[PDB]
Amino acid sequence: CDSIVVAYYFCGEPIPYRTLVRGRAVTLGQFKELLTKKGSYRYYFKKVSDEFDCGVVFEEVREDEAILPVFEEKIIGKVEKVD
Amino acid sequence: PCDSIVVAYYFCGEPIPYRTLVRGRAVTLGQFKELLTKKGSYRYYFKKVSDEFDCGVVFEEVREDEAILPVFEEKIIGKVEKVD
Amino acid sequence: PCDSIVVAYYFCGEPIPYRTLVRGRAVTLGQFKELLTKKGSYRYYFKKVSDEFDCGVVFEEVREDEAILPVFEEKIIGKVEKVD
Numbered sequence: 001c002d003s004i005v006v007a008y009y010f011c012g013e014p015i016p017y018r019t020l021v022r023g024r025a026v027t028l029g030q031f032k033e034l035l036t037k038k039g040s041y042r043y044y045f046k047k048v049s050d051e052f053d054c055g056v057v058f059e060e061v062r063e064d065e066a067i068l069p070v071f072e073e074k075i076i077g078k079v080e081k082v083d
Numbered sequence: 084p085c086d087s088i089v090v091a092y093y094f095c096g097e098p099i100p101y102r103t104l105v106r107g108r109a110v111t112l113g114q115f116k117e118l119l120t121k122k123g124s125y126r127y128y129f130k131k132v133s134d135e136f137d138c139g140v141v142f143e144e145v146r147e148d149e150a151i152l153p154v155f156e157e158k159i160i161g162k163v164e165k166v167d
Numbered sequence: 168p169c170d171s172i173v174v175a176y177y178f179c180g181e182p183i184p185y186r187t188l189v190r191g192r193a194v195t196l197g198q199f200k201e202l203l204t205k206k207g208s209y210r211y212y213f214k215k216v217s218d219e220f221d222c223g224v225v226f227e228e229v230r231e232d233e234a235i236l237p238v239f240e241e242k243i244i245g246k247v248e249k250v251d
């Protein structure tokens with residue numbers, strides 16, 4: 001296994017965009033390179049959270065060097081345009 | 084399978100530059116800024132060819148941080164200066 | 168729309184000049200002085216057209232800083248020398 005599945009829902013759209021990334025670990029900045037549209041966005045990723053009752057959160061990630069959480073083996077991101 | 088970039092910067096004149104690899108194709112000032120360990124006010128320059136003259140490439144000052152750093156001969160060569 | 172000016176200076180003899188863009192139409196010595204990172208006593212010169220001979224052009228010494236820096240072929244080319 002030399003890869004990870006990276007899917008994100010984009011600016012509201014219902015069908016998420018899916019791609020494979022070589023590495024087993026992905027950073028925000030790598031994820032940012034898959035995006036095609038310029039502008040200001042916030043990025044969230046499903047992550048398990050003991051501290052929440054329905055198990056899941058969308059963790060906001062901000063720093064490029066940061067390693068994105070993995071939910072059930074995949075990276076599930078939400079990309080939201082600001083404003 | 085090329086998947087990451089070399090980022091070296093000279094830090095306040097200390098000759099020996101600090102070297103690291105960054106995953107991805109291109110790097111922004113803000114990502115570069117996350118590799119730095121010391122707090123404070125700094126300016127940042129990066130080698131990158133100019134179309135002026137002798138012994139000449141430039142050190143381009145970058146400040147935005149969603150700005151994509153120039154690449155000199157395939158690497159990112161930065162100069163980090165503390166504002167005195 | 169234009170918006171900015173290119174400001175490059177050679178610093179203490181270092182060959183590779185440092186390059187930045189400055190917002191606005193024209194730049195003053197005092198604005199130029201704010202780009203500099205190192206403290207101390209310096210003199211500042213800028214290429215500019217001249218009406219004297221051999222190699223055609225001069226380095227005008229500027230000191231006021233309310234003064235507007237000359238523009239050589241659309242850019243500001245400065246020489247910064249530490250007073251030794």
Ligand SMILES: [Hg+2]
Pocket residue numbers: 001002003004
């Ligand atoms: Hg796999």
Ligand SMILES: [Hg+2]
Pocket residue numbers: 010011037081
């Ligand atoms: Hg969008």
Ligand SMILES: [Hg+2]
Pocket residue numbers: 053054
């Ligand atoms: Hg719940």
Ligand SMILES: [Hg+2]
Pocket residue numbers: 084085086087088
């Ligand atoms: Hg590489």
Ligand SMILES: [Hg+2]
Pocket residue numbers: 094095121165
């Ligand atoms: Hg320093």
Ligand SMILES: [Hg+2]
Pocket residue numbers: 138
């Ligand atoms: Hg030389």
Ligand SMILES: [Hg+2]
Pocket residue numbers: 168169170171172
């Ligand atoms: Hg311009």
Ligand SMILES: [Hg+2]
Pocket residue numbers: 178179205249
């Ligand atoms: Hg100097």
Ligand SMILES: [Hg+2]
Pocket residue numbers: none
């Ligand atoms: Hg000559």
